[PDB]
């Protein structure tokens, strides 16, 4: 009831973990090419 | 295939003890019952016809269906909060009768003759046992219904463990 | 206050037909009873005190106990699968008798005279209204009893709608 | 029944899905590091 109430925002806030994860890992990648095309260069 | 349904009333000529009636029919009273009074010694039984039903609603002009529903409140013990019904027997005649009483007089809701029966002990031991058959069933749908009661309880009980287990491994995530 | 039960049994005496055994007490049966028997038309009874049932006990050499105990599955109708009890009536003596049966042998368990009532009519009354009184009661503990259910099955059934309803919020 | 079997399977899905998105953002993050930690080595030895 109130357990469903907590157990639906602790997954939405899961899934949000996860975007997050990711959205950093996305960008982490764009600078290792960006690194990588640097190094080659 | 029948029902029964056992009473008690009290004969205007014999205030201070309890007689008891057993009204017994098919499906409905309106098809026929047969009626024994007894005293716990002797018993007197009679026979009522879905046409002595019909005839009696014609004679007191009342509609069909309100005078089979005023012979299930006296004789089923169903009587409402303005219902008074009043009883009588001869057991030298074995004659039957029963009135409604209203503010200042009353009406005949019912006559039947009730004979003496040559078996009396054999209609009070069957009498009784009907009651503790009764019981025995009675007990044994309590129990059935107490543990359907802890089935519900249980069923509810694991749907809050589910989600306080999975509240639990949410939070350790 | 006070307690009975009402049994049918059959008398080795009369076996053709049907007898009754009303058997009440205060607290617990070993505080003494009252037993009666009746056919429908006459009726025998008698009293059994505490010291007669303590009594009978130590003759027999049977624990106490497990002598009340066996008063019980005898005379309260509380015999479980592997028991079996006989019960013996003389209406010329109003002694009253009842063994157990056990696969190679049998013992008396009990024996009380029982006298013959002037009233039987107003016993059996009694005895009926007593009935009437318990039905009544037992009428009113299933209609509780089946609310009970009902309120239970509704709040389950709104409890899996909620689920249904959760695990379609947490799709979206 | 159907209901809680498929809530706990969200949740079993959710868990591996963060853990997984987990993995790979520390992946991402330690090889970026790693190149990093080349061309400061290596600007490091152009300095004077």
């Known amino acids: 009831g109130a357990?469903?109430?907590?157990?639906?925002?602790?997954m939405?806030?899961?899934?949000?973990?996860?975007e997050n994860a990711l959205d950093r890992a996305e960008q982490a990648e764009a600078d290792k090419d960006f690194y990588f095309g640097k190094?080659?260069? | 295939s029948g029902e029964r349904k056992i009473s008690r009333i009290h004969l205007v000529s014999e205030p201070s003890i309890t007689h008891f009636l057993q009204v017994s029919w098919e499906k409905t009273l309106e098809s026929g019952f047969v009626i024994t009074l007894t005293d716990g010694h002797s018993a007197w039984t009679g026979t009522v016809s879905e046409s002595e039903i019909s005839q009696e609603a014609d004679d007191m002009a009342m509609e069909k269906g309100k005078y089979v529903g005023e012979l299930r409140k006296?004789?089923?013990?169903?009587?409402?909060?303005?219902?008074?019904?009043?009883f009588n027997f001869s057991k030298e005649?074995?004659?039957?009768?029963?009135?409604?009483n209203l503010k200042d007089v009353s009406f005949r809701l019912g006559s039947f003759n009730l004979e003496k029966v040559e078996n009396?002990?054999?209609?009070?031991?069957?009498?009784?046992?009907?009651c503790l058959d009764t019981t025995a069933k009675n007990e044994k749908s309590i129990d059935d219904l107490e543990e359907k009661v802890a089935h519900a309880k249980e069923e509810n009980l694991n749907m809050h463990q589910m989600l306080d287990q999975t509240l639990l491994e949410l939070n350790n995530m």
């Open chain 2, 74 to 86: 006296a004789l089923l013990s169903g009587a409402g909060p303005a219902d008074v019904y009043t």
């Open chain 1, 12 to 18: 939405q806030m899961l899934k949000l973990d996860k």
């Open chain 2, 120 to 130: 009396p002990a054999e209609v009070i031991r069957e009498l009784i046992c009907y």
């Open chain 2, 93 to 100: 005649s074995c004659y039957f009768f029963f009135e409604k």
């Open chain 1, 3 to 10: 357990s469903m109430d907590a157990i639906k925002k602790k």
């Open chain 1, 39 to 41: 190094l080659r260069n």
